[PDB]
mmCIF file of C-alpha atoms in Angstrom:
data_model
loop_
_atom_site.group_PDB
_atom_site.id
_atom_site.type_symbol
_atom_site.label_atom_id
_atom_site.label_comp_id
_atom_site.label_asym_id
_atom_site.label_seq_id
_atom_site.Cartn_x
_atom_site.Cartn_y
_atom_site.Cartn_z
ATOM 1 C CA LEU A 1 0.710 7.405 -1.034
ATOM 2 C CA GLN A 2 3.457 6.528 -3.810
ATOM 3 C CA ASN A 3 5.912 8.789 -1.935
ATOM 4 C CA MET A 4 4.945 6.869 1.110
ATOM 5 C CA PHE A 5 5.306 3.376 -0.198
ATOM 6 C CA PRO A 6 7.407 3.957 -3.243
ATOM 7 C CA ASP A 7 8.297 0.474 -3.697
ATOM 8 C CA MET A 8 4.801 -0.798 -3.285
ATOM 9 C CA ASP A 9 2.683 -2.149 -6.256
ATOM 10 C CA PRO A 10 0.882 1.027 -7.736
ATOM 11 C CA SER A 11 -1.992 -1.302 -8.396
ATOM 12 C CA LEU A 12 -2.187 -2.629 -4.745
ATOM 13 C CA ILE A 13 -2.266 1.333 -3.566
ATOM 14 C CA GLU A 14 -5.168 2.199 -5.711
ATOM 15 C CA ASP A 15 -6.665 -0.653 -4.795
ATOM 16 C CA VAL A 16 -6.803 0.168 -1.030
ATOM 17 C CA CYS A 17 -7.763 3.817 -1.646
ATOM 18 C CA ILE A 18 -10.961 2.967 -3.383
ATOM 19 C CA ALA A 19 -12.024 1.304 -0.424
ATOM 20 C CA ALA A 20 -11.586 3.730 2.192
ATOM 21 C CA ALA A 21 -12.629 6.560 -0.070
ATOM 22 C CA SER A 22 -15.790 4.719 -0.138
ATOM 23 C CA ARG A 23 -16.122 3.191 3.239
ATOM 24 C CA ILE A 24 -17.829 0.094 1.751
ATOM 25 C CA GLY A 25 -15.980 -1.322 4.804
ATOM 26 C CA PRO A 26 -18.482 0.264 7.478
ATOM 27 C CA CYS A 27 -21.287 0.151 4.972
ATOM 28 C CA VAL A 28 -20.657 -3.709 5.076
ATOM 29 C CA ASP A 29 -20.369 -3.737 8.706
ATOM 30 C CA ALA A 30 -24.098 -1.992 8.834
ATOM 31 C CA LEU A 31 -25.816 -4.443 6.715
ATOM 32 C CA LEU A 32 -24.581 -7.555 8.331
ATOM 33 C CA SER A 33 -25.830 -6.067 11.584
ATOM 34 C CA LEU A 34 -29.351 -5.946 10.568
ATOM 35 C CA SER A 35 -29.458 -9.674 10.584
ATOM 36 C CA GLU A 36 -27.849 -9.992 13.995
ATOM 37 C CA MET B 1 -14.754 -26.115 -10.163
ATOM 38 C CA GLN B 2 -14.254 -22.438 -11.007
ATOM 39 C CA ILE B 3 -15.411 -19.718 -8.681
ATOM 40 C CA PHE B 4 -15.200 -16.297 -9.239
ATOM 41 C CA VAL B 5 -14.122 -13.446 -6.670
ATOM 42 C CA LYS B 6 -14.835 -9.897 -7.227
ATOM 43 C CA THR B 7 -11.594 -7.787 -6.050
ATOM 44 C CA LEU B 8 -11.176 -4.336 -4.592
ATOM 45 C CA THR B 9 -11.708 -2.622 -7.703
ATOM 46 C CA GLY B 10 -14.681 -4.628 -9.119
ATOM 47 C CA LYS B 11 -12.187 -6.745 -11.345
ATOM 48 C CA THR B 12 -13.074 -10.500 -11.132
ATOM 49 C CA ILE B 13 -10.530 -12.949 -10.501
ATOM 50 C CA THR B 14 -11.201 -16.768 -11.003
ATOM 51 C CA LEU B 15 -10.125 -19.844 -8.488
ATOM 52 C CA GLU B 16 -10.237 -23.523 -9.195
ATOM 53 C CA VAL B 17 -11.943 -25.036 -5.998
ATOM 54 C CA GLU B 18 -13.474 -28.297 -4.739
ATOM 55 C CA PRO B 19 -16.864 -27.699 -2.831
ATOM 56 C CA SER B 20 -15.202 -29.330 0.219
ATOM 57 C CA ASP B 21 -12.354 -26.476 0.229
ATOM 58 C CA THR B 22 -12.422 -24.324 3.214
ATOM 59 C CA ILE B 23 -12.697 -20.317 3.367
ATOM 60 C CA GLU B 24 -9.217 -20.323 4.634
ATOM 61 C CA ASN B 25 -8.225 -22.308 1.692
ATOM 62 C CA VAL B 26 -9.842 -19.899 -0.719
ATOM 63 C CA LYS B 27 -8.263 -16.861 1.241
ATOM 64 C CA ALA B 28 -4.718 -18.261 0.926
ATOM 65 C CA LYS B 29 -5.119 -18.511 -2.796
ATOM 66 C CA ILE B 30 -6.327 -14.746 -2.644
ATOM 67 C CA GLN B 31 -3.405 -13.805 -1.061
ATOM 68 C CA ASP B 32 -1.547 -15.434 -3.565
ATOM 69 C CA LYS B 33 -2.991 -13.359 -6.584
ATOM 70 C CA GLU B 34 -4.162 -10.059 -4.819
ATOM 71 C CA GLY B 35 -1.588 -9.487 -2.153
ATOM 72 C CA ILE B 36 -3.810 -9.139 0.711
ATOM 73 C CA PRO B 37 -2.906 -11.448 3.649
ATOM 74 C CA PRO B 38 -5.834 -13.439 4.867
ATOM 75 C CA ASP B 39 -6.360 -11.701 8.187
ATOM 76 C CA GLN B 40 -7.089 -8.645 6.333
ATOM 77 C CA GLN B 41 -9.713 -10.370 3.911
ATOM 78 C CA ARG B 42 -13.320 -10.458 4.445
ATOM 79 C CA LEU B 43 -15.586 -12.329 2.128
ATOM 80 C CA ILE B 44 -19.083 -11.882 1.423
ATOM 81 C CA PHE B 45 -21.370 -14.077 -0.293
ATOM 82 C CA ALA B 46 -25.091 -14.129 -0.409
ATOM 83 C CA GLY B 47 -25.649 -11.537 2.106
ATOM 84 C CA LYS B 48 -23.076 -13.338 4.749
ATOM 85 C CA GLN B 49 -19.667 -12.986 5.837
ATOM 86 C CA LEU B 50 -17.768 -16.173 5.262
ATOM 87 C CA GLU B 51 -15.846 -17.721 7.875
ATOM 88 C CA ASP B 52 -12.506 -19.273 7.553
ATOM 89 C CA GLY B 53 -13.202 -22.854 8.939
ATOM 90 C CA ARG B 54 -16.394 -23.408 7.093
ATOM 91 C CA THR B 55 -16.558 -24.892 3.218
ATOM 92 C CA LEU B 56 -17.575 -23.526 0.212
ATOM 93 C CA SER B 57 -20.356 -26.342 0.434
ATOM 94 C CA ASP B 58 -21.380 -24.757 3.756
ATOM 95 C CA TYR B 59 -22.417 -21.557 2.052
ATOM 96 C CA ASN B 60 -24.100 -23.183 -0.943
ATOM 97 C CA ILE B 61 -21.394 -22.082 -3.035
ATOM 98 C CA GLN B 62 -21.553 -23.577 -6.410
ATOM 99 C CA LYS B 63 -19.874 -23.455 -9.662
ATOM 100 C CA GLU B 64 -19.499 -20.261 -11.130
ATOM 101 C CA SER B 65 -20.822 -18.435 -7.831
ATOM 102 C CA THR B 66 -19.275 -14.901 -7.135
ATOM 103 C CA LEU B 67 -17.569 -14.073 -3.742
ATOM 104 C CA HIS B 68 -16.999 -10.525 -2.619
ATOM 105 C CA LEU B 69 -13.876 -9.540 -1.303
ATOM 106 C CA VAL B 70 -13.716 -6.535 0.904
ATOM 107 C CA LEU B 71 -10.352 -5.287 2.778
ATOM 108 C CA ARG B 72 -10.629 -5.407 6.248
ATOM 109 C CA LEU B 73 -10.182 -1.855 6.901
ATOM 110 C CA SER C 1 -23.191 23.763 -3.712
ATOM 111 C CA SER C 2 -25.353 21.955 -6.047
ATOM 112 C CA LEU C 3 -22.155 20.406 -7.708
ATOM 113 C CA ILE C 4 -20.414 19.060 -4.610
ATOM 114 C CA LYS C 5 -23.514 17.337 -4.143
ATOM 115 C CA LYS C 6 -23.239 15.843 -7.494
ATOM 116 C CA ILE C 7 -19.828 14.395 -6.628
ATOM 117 C CA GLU C 8 -20.901 13.031 -3.363
ATOM 118 C CA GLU C 9 -23.710 11.534 -5.057
ATOM 119 C CA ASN C 10 -21.695 10.074 -7.694
ATOM 120 C CA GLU C 11 -19.343 7.796 -5.732
ATOM 121 C CA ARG C 12 -22.213 6.815 -3.454
ATOM 122 C CA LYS C 13 -24.109 5.364 -6.430
ATOM 123 C CA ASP C 14 -21.043 3.261 -6.943
ATOM 124 C CA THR C 15 -21.024 1.885 -3.381
ATOM 125 C CA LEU C 16 -24.701 1.606 -3.586
ATOM 126 C CA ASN C 17 -24.347 -1.193 -6.721
ATOM 127 C CA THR C 18 -21.673 -3.242 -4.984
ATOM 128 C CA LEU C 19 -23.798 -3.446 -1.618
ATOM 129 C CA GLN C 20 -26.646 -4.550 -3.434
ATOM 130 C CA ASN C 21 -24.888 -7.280 -5.205
ATOM 131 C CA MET C 22 -23.208 -8.448 -1.743
ATOM 132 C CA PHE C 23 -26.832 -8.208 -0.167
ATOM 133 C CA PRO C 24 -29.269 -9.287 -2.950
ATOM 134 C CA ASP C 25 -32.171 -10.317 -0.772
ATOM 135 C CA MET C 26 -32.302 -6.937 0.887
ATOM 136 C CA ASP C 27 -34.295 -3.649 -0.004
ATOM 137 C CA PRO C 28 -32.304 -1.330 -2.175
ATOM 138 C CA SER C 29 -33.815 1.683 -0.412
ATOM 139 C CA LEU C 30 -32.739 0.077 3.127
ATOM 140 C CA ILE C 31 -29.254 -0.289 1.819
ATOM 141 C CA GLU C 32 -29.444 3.714 0.704
ATOM 142 C CA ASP C 33 -30.369 4.996 3.980
ATOM 143 C CA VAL C 34 -27.224 2.835 5.514
ATOM 144 C CA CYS C 35 -24.959 3.966 2.755
ATOM 145 C CA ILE C 36 -25.932 7.566 3.572
ATOM 146 C CA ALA C 37 -25.349 7.060 7.273
ATOM 147 C CA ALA C 38 -22.197 4.947 6.943
ATOM 148 C CA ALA C 39 -18.785 6.174 7.468
ATOM 149 C CA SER C 40 -16.089 7.851 5.517
ATOM 150 C CA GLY C 41 -5.953 9.132 6.091
ATOM 151 C CA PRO C 42 -7.462 5.467 5.967
ATOM 152 C CA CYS C 43 -5.780 4.819 2.498
ATOM 153 C CA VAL C 44 -2.572 5.020 4.681
ATOM 154 C CA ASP C 45 -4.243 2.077 6.765
#
């Protein structure tokens, strides 16, 4: 990922990975759905 | 008053806000310190997704409450 | 295989802690079944 975005803030990259490789996003979409 | 926002890595940042500030206003500040555009920010508090046009008071967000930032992936 | 399971089991624990904090009034066991069924390249997104 660093070799893909070599100028990006190394700390901003790591941040995005630990979200996809956790899929906390879809888990949130699923929990929010239970009250709709 | 101070409020806290839990970032992507679980780290907490502080924001100085007024109860009447909007979620939009809060997202703007988060962009300043986290490098995430507002449109890619999703904020969660007390089991609810916060909407841009509502205020902190609207969600019963008080001094030292913690909001959760989730990357819009 | 009782190693890959531990790895898959370790990361899920982390997510479970976060979710419970985001949704304090929800049943932890419910969040767990949801997490297990929940999704995941993407990092490049």
